[model samples]
Target: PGEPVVGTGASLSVELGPRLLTSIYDGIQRPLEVIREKTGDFIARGVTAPALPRDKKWHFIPKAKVGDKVVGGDIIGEVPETSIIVHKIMVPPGIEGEIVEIAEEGDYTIEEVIAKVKTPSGEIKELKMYQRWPVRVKRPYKEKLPPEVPLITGQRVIDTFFPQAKGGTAAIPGPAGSGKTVTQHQLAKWSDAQVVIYIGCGERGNEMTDVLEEFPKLKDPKTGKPLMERTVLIANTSNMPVAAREASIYTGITIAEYFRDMGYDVALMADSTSRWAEALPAYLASKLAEFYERAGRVVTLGSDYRVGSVSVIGAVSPPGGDFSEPVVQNTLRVVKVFWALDADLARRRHFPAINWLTSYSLYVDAVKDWWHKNIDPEWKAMRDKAMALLQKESELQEIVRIVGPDALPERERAILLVARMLREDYLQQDAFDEVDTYCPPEKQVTMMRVLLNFYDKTMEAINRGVPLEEIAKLPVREEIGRMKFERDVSKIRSLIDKTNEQFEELFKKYGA
Candidate 1:
């Protein structure tokens, strides 16, 4: 008989002998080669389109052949007769590898893979490697995460009024140069999150540099260390390859998710995703005929490109400040917080310029518990009332424009006064050089209570025909501001306690 072989499910018996044992596992191994799909740089391969009016034709530029090793920023080809427009193809180490293939010289649309580049390590990474049925990849229903903890920024307006939470997704959409960047920087500097990831995708280099320089100087309230240590800066400036810009947001969100998985609260901010979308146009133009057939949709990018993790706050700059643009609308469809900044408001020097009536937080109810505990009940009420006043002020301004201000109704006049107070006391923030002016949470609550009481008294005065200007001169204005700046927490507490006591007595006398 053959040598007896002992096999058992629970136990194995072996003959006692001097022998060597080794475990072996079978797995498939394939030849390693980096697979890079061809992509065009700034220049197109085909006929150059006319820069001015009424010119549409493929203007070809005679240049180097397909196998040429081009350096960074080398012009592979250009549109004939147009120096303004050029098609430049980057050579080896163009990001991660060397150019391996190229198409014959011809007009090519954006994203048309003109050539393939081998990965630097000579490994075929698993990318778009396999496809699965929709049901197989579907995410299971996890209960929506509760957002009861306040994401304190130490800013009176945001902390007490428009509070966000850790892992909250919000936007600060505004026109060009509208303090949008400044607002983002303030949040990055002051947000309570331990880790903040900021991605300046397709933004100007100067804007990114400003943030990089500012972050290190920011002191973390809890750690007392430079805030830059906890912050990750992913900058894909306008001059960077558009393909890289497409990956920047994902790279940011990936880092955020990694931190979140490690039990860290992360805040990821993507400033201006509009330029990221511009890559789509350029990519599509590279494949002119095929892209046209696909109806301008680059299906290969997949829906996941649009999907972001819970911890992202991405801003979108609408071209010419038009929110109706396709990219802006598409972004708004997915994001939870929509902060629409009015271009006109920015023109008027409104710091936030967030059209409160238009902006909304879907998860606001989720944070109500935090508000109840951390914020005063009157805080939300004051915010809502101030927002309503601003809306009315907006409507009245149009009316007053058609018929002068003097012809406005008394209610309209009163609303305008309230709007001005809200602007001065709430929305206006000098985040740049006036960082010390920020009011802490407790101080903010105290300030709100004082202001609300003043609102009650002033509303009564208006009812009794006292001019709005007279209410502005009320002693409470200076008192509230002073209490807000008090560094000692106990001093702020004492002030709040006294202010609340006085407010109750004053309210009884005013009887509004």
Candidate 2:
């Protein structure tokens, strides 16, 4: 056995193997290679077995010499594991050593000792063709920074409202199929983050099939690269191991943060941590127990584990769509956000089934940072008024349902009208739309101001007794409604400007 067995002579970090974006795995980094080789597509449909093939010899080519210094995650050699995959071997963290051996370019199995290193302490360690880091342990980083930047999910409801800061955490609680999976997919597909790490724990078979199937076909909106180029998935469906189910998120968490250290913004989507806990014993550690690690500030392959801003969005499942489920009941105290999803919405096919409240929903900081320098500062202040107006509109709604909208002042009625337009036009997004799918803050801010400006001018007309009904007939009303689907900021701005000019004339036309 070429493996060293000495006690802790020195403190050492875990190993970080090759870069991902080229590989997919399931709970732990067992390469989940999806390819149609001569082996055909019978390609291990799921994690039915306990481990990857141990004896498969990959063709290794040395990238490091006999005396080069290498660390965890730093590339030392490459192996064309297959036509579709290249295996990266990293210097296992903890040992700084002079390269003592490098195998000739040839076929070598994982257990075969192809390389060796002579450490400072003079102990020799052999390198195999495999790399493994503990799934539960986090990689090391210099510091855990505050989450001040938004993740810029590219979804209007989340980015404009309930903004999630980079390195921040959030949970989506839903029952059955309220489009939880769809919403999750949409974020992975369209978000502007540098990389995406998706963990599907105890999800159904078809759910995994969509992710494995759908992502490769879509192109990222920013760079026009295939979405798969920026994604790494570690999934365990209901069919996989019970114990392995619990390990999926941590598996993904490590890799997500791993890429983040390379200076990329990583968005991690874990679908329903609750189901991952479904069959575990009461004495078994709840995930919250297992998940006390900092978001970033660490690494493993060679003394680095955590760094980079990680925005973790996890899904939680409660039975029959009620918050009273014990899991939901327990988390209300610890988790900062506890939004609800309705089963009836799923029954009626209303996607998302999320709380439509104005505050504490999404973050625009990340997007705003990009815009504050490149675009107008008015956009930053403009959202506050629109969102505040949105909140007040809700209050008036409750009153209208009872005392009747006719009983209120005309101002309140106009508020209701503007609010209804903003809610329907600005909020209800179609994920499948070609242009409307991804909206930048420039477009978002411009849209909000247009909607708000329309409201203000209508109020100006109402002050002159032109009446809300008269302003309702204007073309700007319909144009603002159509603005929800508009992606082109120039057209939106031109349209709003022209409409405002017309509204000015119309208001004066009504003055007499």
Instruction: Find the candidate with the highest TM-score and give its number.
Output: 2
TM-score of each: 0.59, 0.76
lDDT of 2 at 417: 85
lDDT per residue for candidate 1 within 1-512, as digits (tens), equals 01222331211111100000010000000011111111123221111221112223334343445445433223334443222112223221122334455455676443244455445576322111011111111111112354556566666555544566655656666565646665676777677665676666335646655554665587655566666556656655554445444444544454444334323466777675545534333342332222111111011111112111235566778766565655565555555566666777777876666666677776656666666676566556666666666777788888888989876665567677667666666666555434344566665666555555656656666676656664555555555555534566565455445544554455455563
Where in model 2 is the C-alpha error above 4 Å? 1-92, 95-130, 205-229, 278-286, 292-307, 330-353, 358-376
- Candidate 1 has a TM-score of 0.59
Kindly give the stretch of ten consecutive residues in candidate 2 with the minimal lDDT sum: 35-44
lDDT of each: 0.48, 0.62
Q: What lDDT does candidate 1 reach at residue 5? A: 26
Count clashing residue pairs per candidate: 14, 30
Which stretches of candidate 1 lie above 4 Å from their native place?
A: 1-144, 206-222, 238-242, 272-310, 319-324, 407-412, 433-437, 462-470, 481-512
